[model samples]
Target chain A: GYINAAFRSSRNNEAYLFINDKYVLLDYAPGTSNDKVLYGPSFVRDGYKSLAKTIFGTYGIDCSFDTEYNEAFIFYENFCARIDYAPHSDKDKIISGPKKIADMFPFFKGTVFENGIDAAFRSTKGKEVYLFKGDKYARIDYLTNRLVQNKSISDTGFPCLRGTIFEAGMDSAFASHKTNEAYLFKGEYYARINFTPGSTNDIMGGVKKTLDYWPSLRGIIPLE
Target chain B: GYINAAFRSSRNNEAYLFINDKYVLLDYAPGTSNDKVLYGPSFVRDGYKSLAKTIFGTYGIDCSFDTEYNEAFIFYENFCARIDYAPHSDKDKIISGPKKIADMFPFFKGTVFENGIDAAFRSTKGKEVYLFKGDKYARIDYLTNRLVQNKSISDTGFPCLRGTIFEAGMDSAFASHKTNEAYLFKGEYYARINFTPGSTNDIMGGVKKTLDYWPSLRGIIPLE
Candidate 1:
């Protein structure tokens, strides 16, 4: 199935996956076959009321990231919202905004990104965050809340992404909660990247059909 | 006269002017003809021992700004230095740097601006700062130490500069320590800018040949 948004909750040791209005949680265990579906591929309406009422039930999420600030920021087109989620419970509620991304994040105002974003994710270490739009991506320092740099996603910013499926763009992305690894997702394929902030060493280890890597998502999400 | 750098010291109620290896202090009383040169067109080697040792004694200053931290940042080519200045004394000394701008301000590491800047000034209110290069300028929030926005110096960024002489670039600039005004300089010409952060209402009240407006600079430096 096509994934709309994907992010890992470090505190919960789980990854949240969204497909249209339905959702699922996975106990992510890298390098092993131990990953399991911890929750439902149920309606977001039944699990997350705030998201259902504002985002999923309306435009649906395009991308998302856990801000490491006890909240997760979700985006859809030009709009964004801060949602509060529990590590143990299935419920999630809106804390603030279904506001325009430019107004909420003033730093993006006047730039080509004043309209919207394509994909985004916080670095696993929480020191930085990346926002993508078109062929470019902006790397921002999380602590100082300043833009560190911005460049085309190809050889200029991440040499390893050159000639890869993601050189043009990706639908969603999420950094691993336990390591410096990040997963980039598209229609039915996903690639693993060794992400290092402030460096072009993002080694994209080739693309693989999603169902082949996450076996638990096999029958749960339609692959064909 | 040709002005290399200019900045107003709020604490000192004065403005510092630079021309080659020389500098002069002005007791600026805007909106009146009371602005007078309080110091000399003396050697920077004599008054600012620190600047003489690094910037002035070498490549000369390109632009500068009083950081409101009892210190000022002076730039020369790709290098910069943080210097300590006193409100009453004629002496100034370097605190740090003569270092590459990129190494000093890592936020500029990968932008088209990592090399050098044409002009810059801290907003009078000290809430923001602006950096100019070629036809573009970057506005940065001082409190957050983050880049607020960057745009061409044309109609897109400061509409007031659209058809003016500074549409291409400026030599130096400094905001009034007492009001919302800022002075922009380029060789023998100068203009006043009504500076307000986050707004393009910067009305440039036409460029006037420097000698007519700043009479104190008449014979101090070469204007022809």
Candidate 2:
């Protein structure tokens, strides 16, 4: 039920996987995962520390941080999402967003859902960013910070698991830039789900080594 | 002897740390190393696989791949260096480069060293990209991608150690975005060096942990 994030391009220059407050680059080739590069809080004991967690995948830019700048840096076309955080209000416009985002994606120019967004991350394709609130998410108008396209978390590619209440929604969800698969986390261990149609394997199928145990990280950055 | 790469801002969206072919984001903060996140080749056996890796810090885009556009994405900028591999030939410029590279950094416009560049990774500052060759390294003007400064591995900040050859030169070196440190790797072992000026702890200092052992990874990609 904590907060986690994911961005696109595991192969991106700064792509990384963050968990348990540790971080490591999503520097592997497409379709590849490094089981060796596990997570650790302190690098001195483990050899390196991983943080600002966010998983990424194949291409495009779908990840960013509030600490880096006033805006969330979308990987390409100079796109960005300005953040004020918290529930949106008159303060919503106080935060503003993407000066040139409208210039990059004309589609964003028309959006206007203004309330407040909770957690968010980039799409697996890196073409768009999403703002989430429980099981529902809204695509930020690439041109405007306005919440657009309200839909269920499943609409963002998350799948229902055996005992999980994905319908109850997720504390946070992110897409993997490493693979099209995405993740959702709440209280217990995280879960993996892909966007593929009718894919039962979305359940993190087979030898669940990771299921052996790993807690919710400070930031379950999607290693997309 | 091989190639390695690292980039700035493990927190930077595009940053990545490439080791053992598998990669995770360099999303951690500096001064923190994940000992539990140590190193591994295939999880099953390799105690750890630290190699001719790279270091990353600061910010900028310095990552790309051979698959994206059939060009070796120069670690920085979308600027790409076309490569047919092997010794350079007519097909060299036949590959051309990023169209707007000159628009971004003027220095790269006239690069004439058109030959096979061994390996390179971004600097700890994320301002320059280092081209590593044997024990010697040259700085590619971040603004131009042209060779600016050439120096010994020691210049890259490698430290002299108690044993053979570390005092001589390194086979390969890389920067870490997580700790803002650089590393040097030889035949069997690797050492850590920080980006700080004139620091002797480059020896990985006092304790001898990673020096203890660990190799045989599933995919330790050479940074080259």
Candidate 3:
């Protein structure tokens, strides 16, 4: 019942995990509710932060529909939003705080995709944008922002986790020029998908890694 | 695409992640693919080691569907399964090698979870057990080892990640005595629900955490 978003910062070699509306910063204390903190100054917007804390507060621990390529569009609570880099921002700081996405942007308006999408990614190969939820995913006409087609990830020739039709759902998917590979996170594992043709063909040459074994290489840095 | 199973070594402060058929030992390397090595002696069976290198045998990365409370049901490839003392082995050097889950055990037979279960778990309160697939889950008559009732996770009152009917599916779940909490791992995140009463809530006070931010957590140790 919660949503999750993930991204790696250029400044540091670590990845940032945003659940619901809050970001996790593990440098804090230890307790039942102690480790998790809100989004860093780089990602949080004062307005949304105020709204999230005082009024129309949400009660879960995951964010809604988020996709990152050169940038990220995240759905938090009841709003669609995104964060931007600072002025010519050399990874020094986060310039664009959280902003309402649905209302501010006309393309993302009036669609269940606002909150329904589980995973979204913009491929390195042109504007091949796609969004996934459950077994079904939609292809988006990137320029027009309209859904071109809807299909199942199971249809992508991916092994259906022990013959199950649905593959749980993606935890997070990301791409960077340094690695030149797009990584998909789900369950306790992640896969480096072979672009196109066999998108889900992870067994042959397709590499898979576990969350506990996830690597923090400089390549994980996005060259946006 | 790959399966992941996680367990903490009761004897040591370490965790193992098994993928497809190989297990990764995280003691070396830092690059994306470099750090991922085959299962160490601690988690791997010697027979599979020779086969893993050639003839297209996949080295262990992680196994499918595992949770920590008392024990973890790991799915190592090619009948290579072992339970840990937390992960400190007690098999007298893992005598339980060369066994495939589907064939070795009589309790689990006929089909995956008797027809591919999306989720399964036993609550401390009773012998009543459940298995889920698609929108419906089967209630087991534990003593008779038969399916009794089939129902929906939503029909039980948990929100279906929006008004969506299907629960997408779940990877793992477990029960904890510390907080009288039972966890359900679905999609990219995990949630704690109070069964009949719905307690604990989430991240802030509800106790939910995304897989990316998942903690090794010694307290999560089960006390069967």
Candidate 4:
């Protein structure tokens, strides 16, 4: 489909939700599909303003602004994936991915993946991953293990995160540019084989793709 | 009228207010007219009970004891004579005559005057006096002077007996038992007035009595 700039931009802007470049979700354009992706430009400009309002409110600024925005986005994607995946993955698996994604974003920028491809595959399933001017990449993937693993890492710091996410029945996974660690991916996506970064464990590896795959998953499922 | 034992006893007891004698008014029967003479037996007993009740009522002791029974009797005649005469002459007068006269009647033993003469005279003259006891002859006399003169006299030690009596409107020229000393007379009645025993002014005649009289006379008028 020849997506109009307005439409494409709107979708691109929302694509950042999967990419973790935007801290906000802009108001959907008229007739925009619910499946349209929101990315960086949309986040920084409209998304950030909306996100900043939702997070820091109209008067919010500084670290409080950033932290609030980050947390809001984290929870937003977690909730989106939850409702979307409710039918396919059990409440536990669907809710699990977004939480893992949040852990990778971590509030501060630091390199978790050295390669965009690796980071994208690890985050989402390399779905139309985009690189910003700064080589910052965003994507969505089935992040069961990464969610579990990164959540374990997060748990080392905040043990309360897993129990809380599990209780909420949401899943998470995250990705960012190899060079520019500021970019991150959030939200849930479906795939058969798991994609692992640097390939050591099967649970940490990418899921195998199949036509009928993930349809069996329950709750708010995400697509890349 | 020949005074009965009770009257004689009451009179003897009453004479102490005049005579310098060991006197305790605590045992007297409280008569209404005589009640005002001093804090009498009834008053002492009832006052003590009232004091106890006042002090102990907070501890829940019954405080309803009759307070009206409290009474006192002032030896008015003795008090007046004591106020008007020297303790030395009063002491001598008490020691001689009626006081000794009461002693002559063994039936009046333990009473104040016992002879009834002192009480009769005191009642007639309306003497204002107080109860006195113990072996403190000089001290008691000095105390009496302090009460009468409303002043102190320590350096001179003893007082001028005859001069003090005469100054208080007593006759000073009656005969003396000791050489060079004199007596104070009331009508035909007489009593020896000796210098306080072991006083230095005894050899020099009545110097102590003269000195004692002078200080007391400094701010007072002689009744003449």
DockQ of each: 0.01, 0.01, 0.01, 0.00
* Residue pairs in candidate 1 whose N, alpha carbon or C atoms collide under 3 angstroms: none
Q: At residue B19, give the lDDT of candidate 3.
A: 35
> How much does candidate 3 score in TM-score?
0.33
- For candidate 4, chain B by itself scores a TM value of 0.17
Scored against the true structure, residue A126 in model 2 reaches a CA lDDT of: 34
Lowest lDDT block of 10, candidate 3 chain A: A215-224
Q: What is the TM-score of each candidate against the true structure?
A: 0.48, 0.28, 0.33, 0.15
> Chain B TM-score for each model?
0.89, 0.44, 0.48, 0.17
Better of 2 and 3 by lDDT: 3
Interface RMSD of each: 25.2, 15.4, 23.9, 49.4
Of the true interface contacts, each candidate retains a share of: 0.00, 0.00, 0.00, 0.00
lDDT of 2 by residue, A1-224 (tens): 12333333323323333333333433333233432323232221132211111111111223343222223332223333344322211232113323244543454454421222334556543345555554565555444434455454543444345345554555444555445565555544456666543234455642232323332322443322
Q: What lDDT score goes with residue A122 in model 3?
A: 56
User: Looking at model 3, what is the TM-score of chain A?
Assistant: 0.55
Instruction: Write one digit per residue (lDDT tens) for candidate 3, span A116-146.
Output: 4566555554455556666655566544555
What local lDDT does model 3 show for residue B132? 51
Per-residue accuracy of model 1 over A38-156 as CA lDDT, tens digit each: 88887766777555433344345677887874578777666676778766675666666555677567778878667777777787555677877777888776457577765455457
Task: Write down the TM-score for model 1.
Answer: 0.48
Cα lDDT, model 1, residue B128:
75
The local distance difference test score of model 4 is 0.22
Task: For candidate 4, write residues B92-185 as lDDT tens digits.
Answer: 1111111122223233334432312221111111121211111111121211222222212322433443334322323212112233233332
Q: Look at candidate 2 and tell me the lDDT of residue A110.
A: 44
